[PDB]
Each structure stands twice: as C-alpha cells, then as structure tokens.
Design a protein around this nucleic acid. Structure first.
Ligand SMILES: CCC[C@@H](C)[C@H]1CC[C@H]2[C@@H]3[C@H](O)C[C@@H]4C[C@H](O)CC[C@]4(C)[C@H]3C[C@H](O)[C@]12C
Ligand SMILES: [Mg+2]
Ligand SMILES: [Zn+2]
Ligand SMILES: [Zn+2]
Ligand SMILES: [Zn+2]
Lengths: 69, 49, 334, 389, 92, 45, 49, 243, 102, 50, 49
RNA sequence: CCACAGAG
C-alpha cells in the first residue's frame, strides 16, 4: 500500500527516505544501488525496506468515491 | 566418495550421523549425482513413439 | 587467552574464563580495584544522533545487559491512543493509527510521568503524563495548476499528509514547561498518508511513555549493538604479488603494503568486518589467522531522535544499577 | 506443494480491491516485491500486486519452539508491521416485498432516557444500518430488520446480530435495489489481525510452518551491523526436503539487496551463484552468506556461523482465529438428539469409529461409556419386562 | 429424479445409524485447535488456551474437602479464568 | 443531515423516507452511507 | 532376582484386549509401508507382490 | 495429558510426544476431550497417560522419545571435542532443571591446564542429578553409524568414531548420544532402560530434563546449514565426471 | 511497605542448612540474570550459580546458588548484588569522565 | 439476455485504457474471462475428454 | 491413494478382532466364551513388556 | 438435501 514508517528488522525510520529515493531515481538518473547508500541506508534491512516496496496507494487512489472520476 | 570427501561440522553430515533428520542418500543427492529415477519399478516409460 | 579464534568452519573459545575454579591457582576473583584499574572507555566518534565508543576489559554479560536495557528498557514517548473524526482517506483507521504510533517524538521523557492503568479512562490522563497531538488535513483540487504536468504535488493542495502536520496542543501547565522545547516529530518528512480531493483526516493523539518490551514503538534507539574488535595475526611474512591478493581478501582500508619491503601489514583492524575470505585459499593457510578480542566491545548507538545516544547509554547503566539496588534492598521470603 | 499453497497467499487482490464487497477477502497492509523474481512473474504482472514480505531469516535452531517446521517470529518486527493482515466479510440482506402487499422494514432504534441508545444498538445509527467506521462487538446489531407477521400490519424482529470472537469495524454500507424492486443492503466488516501463535507462514519452496513462539528482539541473535532476524527457521527442514533452491534464493536476495538491484531466479537459468558470491565478497560479507551472529541471551559469539539473509515469505489464510473452537453444552440435532456439526452452528467434535477402537484397545470401559453414552445422547427410557418393548 | 430416503437408507452407509450415530457420535465438552510446540512443558502435560478453558468445564461435586475452593470459584464467576460457569443445587 | 453518497457522481444527499434508493443528480442506484460523525478510538499497535 | 522379576512381570495381564492391540499392530504399519519393487532371491522376473 | 493453562489460543504439547501422534506443526488441528465423570477421568489418566504409554504395543520399542533437533543438540553436547568449565557446565545444569534440582558436580575430566568437564559428564548428571536420585543404569549400545576398531580383537567401545556407548554406574564412559541411545525404535536406549528399571516417573523426569537442556542450549550454541555445506569440492567435480 | 512478592526463596529446593538455595525473581529476564550469574561466579566461595526462565509466556526467573560449607547462599546473593552495583558505578564513572573529556 | 463474458469483444472492457477502466471501477490487471451472474462470478473450467 | 485401502483393511481387522481378551485363567477367549488360543503366543508374554 | 473448494 504505502511505505512503512520503520524498518522491520532494526527499526530505522525509512518513511521519509521514500520521496528522496524517488527523486534521486528520477531527476538525478542514478542507479538505485547508489541512491540507497546516499540516503544513509547502510544496513541491507533498510535497503530492502524501500527497494522492494510497491507504491500501491497511487494505483488505489484512482478509484476515489469522494470525487467524480 | 562424496560422503568420504565431506569434512566435519558439515551440517547435513552431522544431521545424518545423529539420525535426527535426513540420511546419507539425501546428502549424496544434493552434493553428488542424484541417480536414476525409477517409475513403477522400471525406468521412464516411452511416452512417445 | 582472551582471543576468540575464527576458523573456516567453526568459532572456538567463545566463553568467558576469568573466575576462580577455572584453574588450580584460582585467580581472577572479583576485586573492584582491579576492575577499576583495567576497565576503559574510548569514544571514537559522537554525532547528534549516533555514538561509537569502545569498552575495554569488561565482561560479555555486562555489555549484553547494557545492550538489552538500551533496546527494551529505556522509556520513551510514543503515540499511544488515537481518536478519529471524519477519516475518509483510503488508508484505514487502524493502519493510519499504527503509522501515527510509529513516528518518533522529540521530547524528553524525564519531563513526564508514568501512566496508571487502574484508574478510569476519564481520570487516567492528566497533564503530567500525556502529550496531545492534533492532525487536521483537508485535501482539495488546486484550480491553478499547469495543464502539461500530472505531478500529484501540483494537481492538489494537500496530497501528501506528512508527519510535521501533527501539531502540538498544550493542556494546562504544559503551556509553561514546554516553552523552549515544543513537541515535534523527530523526522518531519515521514509520509503519513496520501490524499485526493474530497478527503479529510482529523484526529487527536494522546501520547504517553512506555518501555520497548511492551511495544517496539517505545524503543528509544533505532540501533543499539556491539561488535568485538577484530584482530589479524600474520605469522609468516607475505611477499610480492600474493600479498596484493592478500590485500584483496579484506576490505580496502584494512591491510596495507609496505613499499620498503613489498610485504603486507595490518594497517587497521577496526574497519574489518570479519569475512574470513582469506581462509578460502590454501596459499595463506598456516600463514595468517583471525580472531576477535572477547573483552573489547565497539558499540554503535543510533538514536531515534528523542535522546542523545550517550544519554541512552547512561540511562541503561543507571537502570541496571537501579535493578541491582532494588533486588538488594528487597526482603527474602519463603 | 508451493504450486498448491501459493494460491492461499494473503496480499493485494486488485487495484479496485477497496471498491469491492466480496463474501470473504484477505488483504495485507504492506506487501513487498520478491527479492528474487522470475521471468514468469514479470510476464503475469505478479510484480505489481504481490502477496508476501521479505523477511531477514537466520537459519538456525534458536529455541525448542522451532521443532517440526515451526517458525520463530520477532515481536518487534510484528509490532512494526510485519505480516499485518486484514479480513473483510460481507453481510447481505434483501427486504422482500411479499404477495400480501407487505414489505420488510429496516428502520428501528431504542434509546435510553439519558440520551444513549441501548447497548445492543450502540453502533446502529438512526437509519437502522450500522454506522460506517464504528466498532461492532459480539452481540451488537448492525442491520436491523422487522418482517410482517401476517404472511395496519405489525412487525416481528429479525435482527442481523454480529457474532465473533474479536470485535470488527464496519467499512461500507451499500443500499441499492435490484430489477425486481427489492431493497438490497450489503454491509462490509473489516478486522485487523496481527500474527500470533498458530498463524501459518509459507516459504515459496514448500517449507510451511506455524509461529511456534513470539520472542522480543533483544533475545534474538544479531550481526555486527545490528540487524536482528525477523523469522528463525529450523535447519532440519532442509536435508530431508532437499531444497537447495532456498539457499540459492537467500544468497541471491542478499547479493541483490546489497547491490541494490533485483536478481532473477528464472527456471533453467537465472542469475548464477558465482556472481552472487563475487558481489557479496565485494560488499564485505561471506561468500556463502554465512555470517557471525552474537547470541541475544548469553551475549557471546555463536560457536558456528549462521546462514543469514532475505527470504520472501507469505502469510496464509489459515489463521487460528477461524480454527479455535470449543463446545461444552450447546445445540442438539432434532432427529438424533446428538450435538450438531460445524463450528458455525457451534457443533461438537466427532469421536469416530477408530477413536472408539483405540479406546477399546486401551480397555477403558468406563471412559468409553462416558464418552459415547453419558456426555452425548443419554436417555432414560421405560422398558417392559414381559414383552421387551 | 432424486431417489427418496427409506429406512434401509437410514440404517446403511457411512452416514447411517450404525456407523454414524451408534458406533461413533459427536460428543460434548470438546475443542479443536491448531497445535504448536512447547519444550518447557512436561511430556504428560498439554497447554490449553484460557479462551478454551473458560468454555470447557468440569462438573465437580461439593464435598467436605473442596468446599472452600468451590466457594471461591463460584465467587470468581465465569469471566475470570479460575471460576465456574454453572451451579446445580442438590434438591433442584 | 447529509448521510449518503452516490457511487459515481459523488454528491452527498439525504434520503427522505418517502423517496427511492436513487441519486437525484444522475440515474445511479448505488448509495454508500457516509462515515459517522461519532468519535471512535484506536490503540496504536 | 532381576531375571525372575522381569519374567514374572512380563506375563500378559488378564483382561487385556489383546485382539484389539493385535488388529491395530497389524493394520497401522500398512500406512507407513509404501509400495516398493521386490524380487525373490536373485531372479528378476518373479515379481512377487 | 494433564492440563496447563497458557494464553496463546493454540494447544501446546511437548515435541517428544509428537511421534506417537504423527503430528507436524504445519497447520495440524488436534482434538481435546474432557471426561465428565470421576471414573472416566481416573481411567483416562491411569491407562492412557503419556507416562504409562512410553512404549508402542506393536513391538515394545519406545515411540515417545527425542525427536529431531533434540538428538542434534544432545549429540553436540556429547561430542568428543566439547569441553566446559565450571561456569558453562553450571549454566547447562541450571537450564535443564529450571534451577530446582540440587546437583553435585563430579570431579572434572581435565585438571592440570584448566578444570574442564566433558559433555558426557553433563549427560551423566542429566541421568542422575544427585545421590538422592535412585536412577542407576548400565547399558552397552551401538549407534546409527558405527566404524569398527582398527583391529578385530578390540572391544566395540574402542571404535574410531566412538559410536559405541557404555553406561556403567550412571556415568557415560563412551559414545555419543544419537538416534540409537536417546531416540525411538530401539530397545537399548537410555530412556527405555530407565523406564524398565525404575518406572515411568524417572523416565519422564529425564526426558523433560533433556528436552529443556536441548531447547535452551542450541540458542547459545548456533547450528546452521548453508550452501557451503552442500557445494562440492573442486576435486569431486572431476571424479564424478570420470565415473 | 517492601514488595514481599518481588523475590522469594523456594523452600522445596533449598538445603536445610542453607548452603544451597533457589531464589525466584518476579518481573525480570536474562538482562539481570546473566549479569548476576557472571558476578556471583566470581565469588570464590560459590560452587554453583545458574539462572533460567521456566516459561517465556510468564515473567519469572529462577536462579540457583550453591556454595561450599563456609557461607550460606543468601549472603552470596547479596554480595553478588552489591558487586553488580559497584561494577555499574565504575562503568558509569568512567563513561562520565570520558564524555566530559570530549 | 445473453450473459457476456468479461473482456470479450462484446464487453465494455475491450481495448479500454486504464483511465476508462478506472472510470468503470474495474481493475486493469484482471484476467477477465468469467461470467458475472446473480452477483457472483463464475468460471467455466476447460474440460478434457478422450 | 494408499489411505483408502489401508483404512478399509484396518477397519476390517479391528471389527474382526475386537472381541478377544485374555481371561484370568490365561486363555484367550472370544466374547461368546470360546477359546482361540490356550495361551497367548504359546508362552503368555505381552510384547509390551 | 447435494455439489465444489481447501486443511491434515
Ligand atoms: C532525572 C534524570 C536526569 C538525567 C536524565 C540527567 C542527569 C545527569 C545527566 C548526565 C550528567 O549530566 C552527565 C553527562 C553530561 C553530558 O552533557 C550528557 C550526558 C550525561 C551522561 C548526562 C545525561 C543526562 O542528562 C543525565 C543522566
Ligand atoms: Mg502435517
Ligand atoms: Zn533496518
Ligand atoms: Zn409389555
Ligand atoms: Zn449520483
């Protein structure tokens, strides 16, 4: 659905790193293996926390009953 | 020869020596040649002409 | 002696051996003068959110007790209860409440008091123990948007409900004691929710303090762990091209080469995560051996933002001492 | 076994899974991509809608609670959102318009003098249909009904009372009409479940198991960087079941997450082991993925290296909430005067023929007589001595 | 056309009276639950959930030896775990 | 007291008792009941 | 004394449902006894069931 | 069984009782009946009890015994090259009895360099914790794997891999505990001898002690399987190809 | 006033002359038991010291201490607790001095 | 009324982009091929015969 | 597919052998008090002990 | 009352 607030294994706050990771992927045209390390994600648990995440909230929000599609 | 060539503190070898789980055949199949597959006592039947 | 050896398949001599009854001479008794003389602390680095210090000549049990108490005994403040008014978002009430509970809060929990549970709900919460956070975000369609773009940050006005939207609402005397230290999330960029026009999220979070054993949201450390200091023993000197291969068997800053002799020497061992790749090759067998010092602990305390890490370590030491004092002063009954 | 048990995985169903009202639906809060993918996964678009999370697993015997396929979950990992799931159920009702020019009604509510409704209608609302977002406990009513008693017109109450072991929450209340002009009301109840003891966890290589224990994260092992494993599995499940692909998947996932790129595990090919070893060595770990973990309890070095890395687990729909059952005394069948069947009808367990045979084999006469006569269908009857009837 | 159910049909088969309701039958005071290991439990012991133990009851007759214990159990009630669910008087 | 939302047009409207299950801004016949205004609490776990 | 005690307590206890125990002890190995090909003493075609 | 009350919504039974049930913790649902009369309850506990049914009636062999992951830890403790000092030995003894049984430490097997005990002495204490305990057993048994000695005249206890166990007095003088001395299916196991010599209570006590020790030991002494335990050596890929 | 239910002495396991005992501590876990075991094993008159958690579902700890025939077990437990307090004090003082140094 | 099978050449979801598919409250990543009858969704499984 | 036949065989065996018991005169007798064996196995020893 | 679908 949405990015988790904390990493499951250790507990580092990684919810804030998702937007920065997307920005480093898009406008900086860097491979994700470097963008993960730039954001302070040293341990591989925090790496897999946002490397493997699916941003399903964007797909879900198209079907919003509160506004005409 | 595969079982003879495995050193101590090899986990499948230890679990086979204990008898807790597995056997010599399983370690031989994982590390060495698996062997002939036998179906209904014979080899694989000719499913084609 | 006190060096835990590292082999290609096993780890040998991993237990403490400093107590009478371990040998005939029965030395290494508990004498606090000797421990005070030998124990040492070297703080190699210290940032605003991370500490790295070495404890020397301390037993494994005490260091592990410090680590466990840091992880799940130092109290910290986290969002416990959430009250909802008109949450029409796609993210459900339970999930949103959990995400709000998981954010860290930059408050000092020494200014708050533990919460009694036996009192009724209308009297349990007071001004000495709870912090009230208010979130109130309503999304709407932004009329003046560039037509050539589809960025969610531009099409709407409050598409991304962040963590800094959790404003702090003082209650009573908190208006005085929280003057120069307002309540704020430690990381304000946490993405709490995503919205589309016609949706609204409004809620009040009651924040209390608990221990990490009850829930993981109360743990004040993002990371609290130690590693033994590695040690590399080069027995027979290694010359020439193979030495470069030896240099390839370790992380780049670990082992260097002496240009005056073209031989390998241990430049530094603290940078060596023990990979024991050098034990794979027979050309280095019975030439180099690996170990760790069993009483040389390098901690690495990364805080969650609520505390400085040295404060967390000191709190852990004080909590262990208070546990010992409480057990000592309690009576013994049959 | 994995082909059979991957169809029970809990995960995202569809892009419109929140606009659907299905009879039983399982959703996961934080699904994740597989670390080790497959070309078949890419073609069938399983990548967009996964079912399962990557867990840092340490293949070791942590306690006695992992024997016989059981797993050792992490309490802090569960608290932070690992394996969090929700279940959505649908209750439907139709206001039939009877042939006597009479129709069923929805409205109805009872209020105490203080300004509060009655407890059975605590979350009912002023329109007889349960309020969206309100908790529903056991015994409460979320759909209020009253049918005519003669098919003015009187009504008899036939409410739709919620019954369950844990409270739920109303998610949607949909009113409509069909073609034959009957009011159709569908209420969707969702409840949030966290993993506990008895919840089944698969491994995408068979290797099924249940959560035997939940331990705090300060007790689990940890490596030098401080990473604490989420699920600890018993090594003894490998040698008999011979799943080398699991070890290859773990190493491939570790090397991929360290390199930052997903690694392909396509059948008859995929990313080879040697490249994984090279990447792991260049990242500073062991070539075979076996690291050195410090014990969480005694604090010292573990005497053997521990196989350590990410493995994609799936939570399955066989949770213990829907399996636990107990009868004591309950309803009975009309024809046989024996306890009913099925936990939906609060039935009781059946002592079959072979259980009777085993009790015979022990020779316990009194226990068999109590189990098959006294506690099930005992009946005092009067028989005539002269004729035997 | 569906065949009807006769007396011979009611007495024969795996669902007949002889093999379905007389040789073995569904019983009261039973529970079905998923299992999980517990090595710290003795081999002659099984751990039962308290959510099941609050339902499955044992009928104990009051004697001169357990009168105080059963009085305390009745005082506790059917919500806390050590307690009782029903009472049956001697003359009633 | 607005209590019902049409599925597709999303126009909040209140049903009088003598009126059909039908939105009045279109022809749609699906109505989702709006979220309650009453307080509901949740423990963060 | 030990031998006599073992023999004297090893006698079958009267009242034991020995037929039930025997029936189960013959029946339940049938569950674990998987089908495997058999031949009678060095000749292949005898294919004993 | 005897009932205990635990708050986790799942039935829990000791893994040593898994084998007669043929149960695996992979979603197994099991049934619980409660007798409602005193006669039935007494007959159930004194005829169908776990202690009174350690032997399957098919052949008399034990069927309730150490399953997997209890044999492995017991073997690793009883390995030849495992030595413990006073602290670790005392911790091991405390874990197997919950700090309730009064132990008496035997003299160590190695004395001059350090005071080191052997894991076989740990199991000697497991069988007989102290002098007040009446369990005294003697048995000679083979193991699952057994390499004969270097000559044809030596006794079986002098084997190369030490696959022959001798228990005299109550000490374990040779051999390693595996699925021929602690497991099921053999009539010369430790628990079978203890049962036949001193009733079911002592066998149950020893079984509980072993289960607790092997549950609490392997956590503090890791034991793992990886691809390094399965990858063949360089020379095997040539001999296998040639053959 | 003192919490009499905090620590108990199990009378079923202790020796009659007091040279051995098995104390029971409520609301504790390994983080105290390991430190206490390590400290008590440094008492030269302590012959046996070991902790255990009888069941992880309940918060309880059992620690057994046996000495030689010169001192009791309660004295060993109190001396171990005092030594643990002193060790924590030394660690605290050294950390305070070194953090003042930086 | 002949019950249309989803994503056929006669269904409304044929060659529909994900925007119009989102307009009709239907998932674009849905296989189709099933009949919605009486509210439920049923699948005619492929039969195999001699 | 082995389970159906194995269970049927076990049920048949147990229905056949359910009535046997060892009487107090050390003779295995049916329900109708007819002797099958004069001593169980020829020596009256339980295989359990 | 049947028939599917899973769990051992
Ligand atoms: C009520 C409890 C008070 C407690 C939380 C206060 C009172 C005493 C304080 C420590 C001492 O000042 C010594 C150090 C000073 C450094 O600058 C920062 C760290 C340091 C260890 C302090 C941390 C913290 O601030 C303490 C423990
Ligand atoms: Mg099974
Ligand atoms: Zn992490
Ligand atoms: Zn008559
Ligand atoms: Zn409308």
């Amino acid at each position: 659905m949405i990015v988790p607030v904390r990493c499951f294994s250790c507990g580092k706050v990684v919810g804030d790193k998702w937007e920065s990771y997307l920005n480093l992927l898009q406008e900086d045209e860097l491979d994700e293996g470097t963008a993960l390390s730039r954001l302070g994600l040293k341990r591989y648990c925090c790496r897999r926390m946002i490397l493997t995440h699916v941003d399903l909230i964007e797909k879900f929000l198209r079907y919003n009953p509160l506004e005409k599609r | 020869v595969c079982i003879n060539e495995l050193d101590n503190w090899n986990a499948p070898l230890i679990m086979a020596t204990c008898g807790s789980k597995g056997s010599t055949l399983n370690v031989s199949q994982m590390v060495a040649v698996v062997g002939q597959q036998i179906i209904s006592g014979n080899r694989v039947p000719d499913g084609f002409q | 002696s006190n060096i835990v050896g590292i082999e290609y398949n096993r780890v040998t001599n991993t237990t403490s051996t400093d107590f009478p009854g371990f040998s005939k001479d029965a030395e290494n008794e508990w004498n606090v003068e000797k421990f005070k003389k030998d124990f040492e602390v070297n703080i190699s680095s210290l940032d605003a959110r991370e500490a790295n210090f070495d404890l020397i000549n301390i037993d494994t049990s005490i260091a592990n007790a410090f680590r466990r108490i840091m992880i799940s005994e130092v109290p910290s403040v986290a969002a416990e209860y959430v009250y909802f008014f008109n949450n029409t978002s796609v993210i459900q009430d339970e999930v949103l409440a959990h995400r709000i509970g998981l954010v860290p809060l930059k408050v000092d929990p020494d200014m708050l008091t533990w919460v009694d549970s036996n009192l009724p709900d209308d009297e349990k919460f007071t001004d000495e123990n709870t912090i009230v956070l208010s979130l109130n975000v309503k999304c709407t369609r932004n009329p003046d948007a560039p037509k050539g773009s589809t960025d969610p940050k531009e099409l709407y006005n409050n598409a991304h409900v962040y963590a800094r939207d959790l404003k702090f609402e003082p209650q009573g005397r908190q208006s005085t004691t929280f003057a120069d230290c307002p309540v704020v999330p430690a990381d304000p960029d946490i993405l709490l929710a995503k919205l589309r026009p016609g949706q609204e999220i409004s809620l009040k979070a009651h924040c209390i303090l608990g221990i990490g054993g009850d829930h993981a949201k109360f743990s004040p450390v993002s990371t609290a762990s130690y590693r033994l200091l590695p040690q590399i023993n080069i027995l027979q000197p290694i010359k020439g091209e193979s030495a470069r291969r030896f240099q390839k068997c370790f992380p780049p800053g670990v082992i260097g080469i002496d240009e005056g002799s073209d031989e390998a020497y241990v430049k530094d061992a603290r940078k060596d995560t023990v990979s024991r790749e050098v034990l794979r090759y027979e050309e280095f067998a019975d030439k180099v051996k690996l170990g760790r010092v069993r009483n040389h602990f390098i901690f690495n305390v990364e805080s969650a933002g609520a505390m400085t890490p040295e404060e967390i370590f000191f709190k852990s030491v004080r909590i262990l001492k208070n546990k010992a004092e409480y057990l000592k002063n309690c009576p013994i009954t049959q | 076994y994995q082909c059979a048990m991957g169809k029970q995985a809990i995960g995202a169903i569809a892009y419109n899974q929140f606009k659907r009202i299905d009879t039983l639906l399982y959703l996961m809060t934080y699904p994740q991509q597989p670390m080790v993918k497959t070309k078949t996964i890419e073609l069938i678009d399983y990548d967009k809608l996964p079912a399962g999370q990557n867990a840092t697993v340490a293949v070791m015997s942590y306690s006695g609670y992992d024997i016989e396929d059981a797993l050792v979950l992490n309490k802090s990992s569960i608290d932070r959102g690992f394996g969090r799931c929700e279940t959505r159920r649908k209750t439907t009702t139709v206001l039939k318009r009877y042939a006597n020019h009479t129709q069923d009604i929805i409205g109805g509510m009872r209020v105490d003098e203080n300004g509060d409704p009655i407890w059975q209608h605590q979350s009912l609302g002023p329109d007889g249909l349960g309020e969206v977002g309100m908790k529903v406990q056991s015994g409460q009513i979320y759909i209020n009904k009253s049918v005519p008693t003669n098919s003015q017109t009187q009504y008899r109450e036939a409410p739709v009372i919620y019954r369950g072991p844990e409270p739920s929450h109303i998610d949607q209340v949909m009113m409509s009409v069909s073609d034959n002009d009957q009011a159709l009301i569908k209420v969707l109840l969702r409840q949030n479940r966290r993993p506990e003891l008895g919840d089944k966890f698969s491994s995408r290589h068979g290797q099924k198991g249940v959560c035997g224990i939940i331990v705090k994260q300060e007790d689990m092992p940890f490596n030098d960087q401080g990473i604490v494993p989420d699920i600890i599995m018993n090594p003894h499940g490998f040698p008999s079941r011979m799943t080398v692909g699991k070890m290859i998947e773990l190493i491939s996932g570790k090397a991929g997450v360290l390199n930052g790129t997903l690694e392909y595990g396509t059948c008859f090919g995929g990313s080879k082991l040697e490249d994984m070893s090279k990447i792991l060595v260049d990242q500073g770990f062991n070539y075979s993925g076996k690291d050195m973990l410090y014990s969480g309890i005694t604090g010292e070095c573990l005497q053997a290296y521990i196989f350590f890395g990410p493995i994609y687990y799936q939570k399955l729909k066989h949770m213990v909430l829907d399996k636990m059952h107990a009868r004591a005394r309950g309803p009975r069948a009309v024809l046989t005067r024996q306890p009913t069947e099925g936990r939906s009808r609060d039935g009781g367990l059946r002592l079959g023929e072979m259980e009777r045979d085993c009790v015979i084999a022990y020779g316990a006469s009194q226990l068999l007589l109590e189990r098959l006569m006294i506690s099930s269908d005992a009946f005092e009857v009067d028989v005539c001595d002269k004729c035997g009837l | 056309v569906k065949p009807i159910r006769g007396f011979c049909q009611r007495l024969k088969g795996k669902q007949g009276r002889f093999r379905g309701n007389l040789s073995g039958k569904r019983v009261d005071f039973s529970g079905r639950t998923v299992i999980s290991p517990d090595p710290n439990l003795s081999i002659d012991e099984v751990a039962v959930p308290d959510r099941v133990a609050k339902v499955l009851t044992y009928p104990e007759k009051v004697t001169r030896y357990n009168r105080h214990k059963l009085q305390e159990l009745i005082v506790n009630g059917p919500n806390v775990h050590p307690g009782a669910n029903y009472l049956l008087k001697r003359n009633e | 007291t607005l209590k019902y939302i049409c599925a597709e047009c999303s126009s909040k409207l209140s049903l009088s008792r003598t009126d059909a299950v039908r939105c009045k801004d279109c022809g749609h016949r699906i109505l989702l009941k709006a979220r309650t205004k009453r307080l509901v609490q949740f423990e963060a776990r | 004394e030990i031998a006599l005690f073992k023999y004297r307590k090893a006698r079958l206890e009267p009242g034991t449902a020995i037929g039930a125990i025997g029936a189960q002890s013959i029946g339940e190995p049938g569950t674990q006894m998987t089908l495997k090909t058999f031949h009678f003493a060095g000749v292949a075609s005898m294919n004993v069931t | 069984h005897y009932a205990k009350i635990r708050p986790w919504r799942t039935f829990r039974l000791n893994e040593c009782v898994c084998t007669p049930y043929n149960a695996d913790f992979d979603g197994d649902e099991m049934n619980l009946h409660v007798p409602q009369t005193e006669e039935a309850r007494a007959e159930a506990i004194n005829l169908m009890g776990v202690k009174n049914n350690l032997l399957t009636p098919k052949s008399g062999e034990p069927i309730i015994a150490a399953t997997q992951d209890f044999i492995t830890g017991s073997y690793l403790i009883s390995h030849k090259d495992s030595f413990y000092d006073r602290a670790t030995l005392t911790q091991l003894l405390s874990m197997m009895s919950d700090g309730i049984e009064h132990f008496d430490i035997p003299p160590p097997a190695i004395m001059k360099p350090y005071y080191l005990w052997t894991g076989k002495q740990v199991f000697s204490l497991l069988i007989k914790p102290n002098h007040n305990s009446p369990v005294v057993i003697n048995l000679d048994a083979k193991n699952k794997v057994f390499v004969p000695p270097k000559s044809k005249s030596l006794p079986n206890e002098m084997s190369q891999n030490d696959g022959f166990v001798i228990i005299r007095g109550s000490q374990i003088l040779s051999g390693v505990m595996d699925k021929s001395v602690l497991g099921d299916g053999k009539k010369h196991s430790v628990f079978y001898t203890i049962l036949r010599d001193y009733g079911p209570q002592e066998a149950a006590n020893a079984m509980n002690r072993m289960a607790k020790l092997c549950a609490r030991f392997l956590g503090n002494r890791g034991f793992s399987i990886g691809i390094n335990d399965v990858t063949p050596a360089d020379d095997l890929k040539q001999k296998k190809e040639e053959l | 006033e003192p919490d009499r239910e905090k620590i108990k002495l199990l009378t079923q396991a202790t020796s009659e002359d007091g040279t051995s005992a098995s104390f029971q501590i409520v609301e504790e876990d390994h983080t105290l038991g390991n430190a206490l075991r390590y400290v008590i094993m440094k008492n030269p008159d302590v012959e046996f010291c070991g902790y255990s958690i009888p069941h992880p579902s309940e918060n309880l700890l059992n620690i057994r201490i046996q000495t030689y025939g010169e001192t009791t077990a309660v004295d060993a437990l109190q001396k171990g607790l005092k030594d643990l307090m002193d060790l924590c004090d030394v660690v605290e003082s050294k950390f305070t001095e070194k953090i003042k140094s930086m | 009324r002949m019950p249309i099978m989803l994503r056929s050449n006669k269904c409304i979801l044929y060659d529909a982009d994900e925007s119009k598919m989102a307009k009709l409250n239907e998932c674009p990543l849905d296989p189709g091929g099933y009949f919605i009858v009486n509210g439920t969704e049923k699948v005619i499984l492929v039969q195999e015969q001699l | 597919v082995k389970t159906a036949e194995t269970g049927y065989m076990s049920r048949r065996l147990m229905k056949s052998l359910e009535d046997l018991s060892c009487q107090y005169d050390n003779t295995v007798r049916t329900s109708a008090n007819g002797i099958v064996q004069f001593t169980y196995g020829g020596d009256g020893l339980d295989p359990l002990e």
